[PDB]
Amino acid sequence: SVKAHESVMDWVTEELRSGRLKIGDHLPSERALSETLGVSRSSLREALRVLEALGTISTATGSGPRSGTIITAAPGQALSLSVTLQLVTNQVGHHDIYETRQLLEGWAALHSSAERGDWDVAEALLEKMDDPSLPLEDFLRFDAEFHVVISKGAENPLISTLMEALRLSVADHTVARARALPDWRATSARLQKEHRAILAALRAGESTVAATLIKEHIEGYYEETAAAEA
Amino acid sequence: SVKAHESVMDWVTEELRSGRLKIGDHLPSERALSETLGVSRSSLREALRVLEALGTISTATGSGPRSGTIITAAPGQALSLSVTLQLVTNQVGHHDIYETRQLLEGWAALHSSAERGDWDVAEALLEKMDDPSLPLEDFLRFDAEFHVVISKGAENPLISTLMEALRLSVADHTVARARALPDWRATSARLQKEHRAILAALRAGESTVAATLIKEHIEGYYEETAAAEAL
Ligand SMILES: [Zn+2]
Ligand SMILES: [Zn+2]
DSSP: OHHHHHHHHHHHHHHHHHTSOOTTOBOOOHHHHHHHHTOOHHHHHHHHHHHHHHTSEEEOTTOTTSOSEEEOOOOOSHHHHHHHHHHHSTTOOHHHHHHHHHHHHHHHHHTOOGGGOOHHHHHHHHHHTTOTTOOHHHHHHHHHHHHHHHGGGGOOHHHHHHHHHHHHHHHHHHHHHHTTOSOHHHHHHHHHHHHHHHHHHHHHTOHHHHHHHHHHHHHHHHHHHHHHTO | OHHHHHHHHHHHHHHHHHTSSOTTOBOOOHHHHHHHHTOOHHHHHHHHHHHHHHTSEEOOSBTBGGGOOEEOOOOOSHHHHHHHHHHHTTSSOHHHHHHHHHHHHHHHHHTBOTTTSOHHHHHHHHHHTTOTTSOHHHHHHHHHHHHHHHHTTBSSHHHHHHHHHHHHHHHHHHHHHHTTOSOHHHHHHHHHHHHHHHHHHHHTTOHHHHHHHHHHHHHHHHHHHHHHSOO
């Protein structure tokens, strides 16, 4: 219930604040927590089931004696589901998603610091993406992941969380745009070349160059799929 | 039921695509849906309660759950729950929230249309915020809502979606920093004047003026609280 939900949020918040608990730690059993909060065991399980679906909480099987309910504090898919659902209606269009990426990625690139980038993780993603047999959908899923990873160079975790939360809707968007592409082989090749030149600029600390390349990369794909007609 | 969730999402998506239902419309009954989707009544209800939490649907219109459930396709509070928990553990800092607001709010104002924002609604928020007997928690709660309201004036609707998803965290953020303010009466006074001017610029189509004022507004409060910290 609401009472249970808020009681839990306030409780977890205070545990994290005091240091008694840390992200990744297991919560007390439902029996114990429900008594501590003064709420029915039923309303507590429901509140936790919802928090689990949202990503705030996560469950690990086989944890006994530990509860198996972990404080993860992940944004979940709510934001992506809202973006993608709105996209179906006249309320939101592909260009709106495209432009959102430009705003966020542009800011991250502009403020990127070479010593802060998880460059090896990003380059590995690009490694899997060169696989000639790799399906169009998987390639674009890694593509969106790659863009989230390189945005970490700006070391702004909130911006990074927003990027991660939008990841699913970004892939949904590029995948749909790709449907009308005449030659995915050639397109993915150019995208890969651009991805590496972007990563190189970021590695060299050429923030302004990286930002320009990212802008041209995202816009290039958007215009290309528009021409293909989709 | 993970299938109940998928079955419902797929159903809602198609109703929206076909045009039979649009954002804001009511869902049919659970009895009707349970059958149509081939999912137990209990599993269907579990999925709907999650969809409600996700922001996809809502039963808080008319007179509450009694008035039914409508399709909202909104962000919900998930991201804010995440952000505020990370804020508490220092995984995310006040500084990060500040930079993010400047980015999102500035763009929304810079690229807005006077015919797009519901200024009277925003104006009404500022009227409640005028009350000198209003505690700072409530004031700042309305403050965050106000900023989300004016962001809907942006040509890109998604900016307001991101703003809405961040709303509760922004409020948590500003309230936390206000506590240390040596003179809240004076502070809230300058914020209202600044809010009015911002709303005035936007209402008049002065996108560039609005964006500059929002930058100074958000920056002003951040530095002021950054100084008012007891230490
Ligand atoms: Zn890319
Ligand atoms: Zn304000």
